[PDB]
Design a protein around this ligand. Structure first.
Ligand SMILES: [Mg+2]
Ligand SMILES: [Mg+2]
Ligand SMILES: [Zn+2]
Length: 494
RNA sequence: AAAAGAGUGAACGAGAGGCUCUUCCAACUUAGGUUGAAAGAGCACAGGCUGAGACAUUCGUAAGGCCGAAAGACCGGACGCACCCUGGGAUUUCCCCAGUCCCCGGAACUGCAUAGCGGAUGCCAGUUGAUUAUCAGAUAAGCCAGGGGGAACAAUCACCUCUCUGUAUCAGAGAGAGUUUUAC
DNA sequence: CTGACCTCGACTTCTAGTCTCGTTCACTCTTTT
DNA sequence: CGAGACTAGAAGTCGAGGT
């Protein structure tokens, strides 16, 4: 039934055992030591032979649903897994990091220099300068001081560079392979190959010549295409294009393609982006879309690098397999549809003489990936200026900020009398900070009952102590009565 | 090689908002207080590194072309710079990395000519301690800071059978050789 | 004459979090010619 | 093949008790 994994005296993985009673005998006799709860790994204390057999590992890639399965010389499955990768959160985190540091450089460095320049009299006589930097054709506006040097002309990268998200997914695949190697003797590795065309899957029955001329053929960039389809004037008025607005904001999964961008003048952008009626009107004229091809892009980028480095890890014992071959295998041997039986079929592909092939039974070991680091310090810099009459909210700022659909103080001031303004009470709460030394998700803790769990969330804080620890199963444990056993493991088995 | 498709990394610039304070006006209230309009000033993850580097005006920034009375304009790209390259550093850690930035040099690659860099004048800091001199302190219009992986740390007994409890399930507790082999 | 109606640990429920553009640049992968 | 949520803090329940 449930296979038990074995390791020798030396740190060498070894063929898994299934007797399941000899294991308890060896454990009670001191011959065996437990190494991992789940999967249940035992390390022999007494020395013995190390005679192993080849095992084929089969990999079904992905961005959030990686899956690997291990099989013997014949079609017997000794390991099945599923992985939920943290990958999707990396692009958003890097985006927010860029925005935060741009804020840092603007507000602490740039604006402070401009302020000092105006104070000390060492500012432009015009008070503003148009500077045409090398590499661009339209100037920039430098107010009261020259800009800090801009570096975009020449920034070479090592060939084969990969973005932090794609590099993260590559590292995650390889890391899960290493963790599987720690458990079992893996001889061959079989990686599924996925190549995607995103001109395809948008329109099947695509004709060959269509691949070269698409929505943005000839017309240079998305901005120019929008300025063309709108005839060079704002979408609302007859005024010229100023800002290229996203119909779906980039804070959501707003696409960067053509069907999302729209040209608008200044005032029209401000109104459509603060007011509600204008937003509804623009949503009426055009719809926009999400990204819809953010995952498969990263997967397609990393597949060749993964195949290369798998070949490095398993010299002379690395193969490949097509998704179509997997589908044929499922149709042939009757494997049910799933997203982890894919790995079993992929592994079974390489088997030259497979006569015991049958579908695995039992749920596979699920793996969650948790942050290895979190170096943020501010939880909620509130930045909102709330006005109340009595105990009811009536305005959220003095004047509307960008993306403020709700009223502000100027509109209330217009609508009501000066007595109502004189009878307002303001409450603006201060900034909240995370505890950067807190116990992080993925840690292994034990509660008052002695139950062992993996910390998934920390919820609620009072007087400097967490209130609740939420395990991966969603159970909530009182934080004061829980004991800290193990730190964050990069990938945690559930 | 090109045209497209899809992603996601980098530098620089403007705002809408936000915090604190000053002046002034208005409203509402026990001269005071509260809210607001207007003008101005300062400030902007928690923090690490460093002691100068930010700013304005002006001069200079190769050969060779080419047009100009000339001044000088355009091309070009070095004996000028660099985001480029070798080495060394800050962020930097339990071990690393990405990104940004810095310092002496610059050979091939790469990029710039209104940019960068250097010079000159001007403007913006700190000055205390232990033995004029040396080690400490103070000194921002300086750099970085919300990215990622790994190691190590269990109250680490899985499966099945049997018993007890509760529990609709199943959980907890206890006890058990259930094929010899964890490999033939 | 309590005691019915407070006061206080100690938990349990629940909600909320910044956002626009502008001048450029770089890397990866796929599909057709 | 895949498109928020972890963490901090305020308001709320509730028993002990107690006066
Ligand atoms: Mg597949
Ligand atoms: Mg907009
Ligand atoms: Zn207009």
């Amino acid at each position: 039934m449930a296979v038990v994994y074995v390791i020798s005296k030396s740190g060498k993985p070894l063929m898994p055992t299934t007797r399941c009673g000899h294991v308890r005998i060896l454990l009670k006799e001191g011959k065996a030591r437990v190494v991992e709860r789940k999967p249940f790994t035992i390390q022999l204390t007494y020395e013995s032979a190390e005679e192993t057999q080849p095992l084929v590992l089969g990999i079904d890639p992905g961005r959030t649903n990686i899956g690997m399965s291990v099989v013997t010389e014949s079609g017997e499955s000794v390991f099945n897994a599923q992985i939920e990768t943290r990958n999707k959160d990396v692009p958003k985190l890097m985006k927010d990091r860029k925005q935060y540091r741009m804020a840092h450089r603007r507000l602490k460095r740039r604006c402070k220099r401009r302020r000092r320049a105006k104070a000390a009299g060492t500012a432009f006589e015009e008070g503003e300068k148009q500077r045409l930097l090398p590499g661009c054709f339209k100037p920039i506006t430098c107010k009261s001081i020259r800009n800090k040097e801009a570096r975009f002309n020449n920034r070479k990268r090592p060939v084969g560079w990969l973005t932090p998200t794609a590099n993260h997914l590559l590292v995650t695949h390889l890391n899960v392979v290493k963790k599987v190697q720690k458990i079992l003797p893996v001889a061959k590795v079989v990686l599924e190959l996925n190549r995607f065309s995103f001109m395809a899957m948008n329109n099947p029955k695509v004709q060959r010549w269509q691949y070269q001329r698409g929505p943005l053929y000839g017309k240079g960039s998305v901005e120019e295409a929008v300025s063309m389809q709108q005839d060079g004037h704002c979408l609302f008025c007859k005024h010229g294009i100023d800002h290229y607005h996203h119909v779906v904001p980039r804070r959501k999964n707003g696409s960067e393609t053509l069907e999302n961008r729209v040209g608008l003048c200044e005032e029209h952008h401000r109104l459509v982006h603060t007011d509600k009626e204008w937003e509804a009107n623009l949503a009426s004229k055009k719809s926009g879309m999400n990204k819809k091809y953010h995952a498969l892009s990263v997967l397609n980028q990393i597949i060749p690098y993964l195949a290369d480095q798998l070949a490095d890890m398993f010299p002379g014992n690395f193969c490949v397999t097509s998704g179509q071959d997997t589908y044929l295998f499922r149709e042939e041997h009757g494997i049910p549809k799933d997203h982890y039986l894919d790995a079993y079929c992929i592994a079974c592909s390489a088997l030259t003489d497979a006569k015991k092939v049958s579908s695995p039974k039992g749920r596979p070991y699920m793996v969650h990936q948790f942050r290895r680091h979190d170096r943020q310090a501010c939880h909620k810099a509130n930045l909102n200026r709330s006005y109340y009459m009595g105990g009811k909210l009536v305005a959220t700022n003095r004047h509307k900020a960008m993306d403020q659909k709700t009223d502000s103080l100027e509109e209330y001031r217009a609508a009501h009398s000066a007595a109502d303004v004189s009878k307002l009470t303001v409450k603006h709460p201060s900034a909240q900070y995370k505890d950067m030394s807190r116990i992080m998700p993925g840690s292994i803790l034990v509660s008052g009952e002695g139950k062992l769990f993996t910390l998934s969330r920390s919820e609620g804080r009072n007087k400097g102590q967490v209130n609740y620890f939420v395990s991966t199963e969603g159970i909530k444990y009182w934080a004061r009565k829980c004991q800290y056993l193990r730190n964050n493991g990069g990938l945690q088995i559930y």
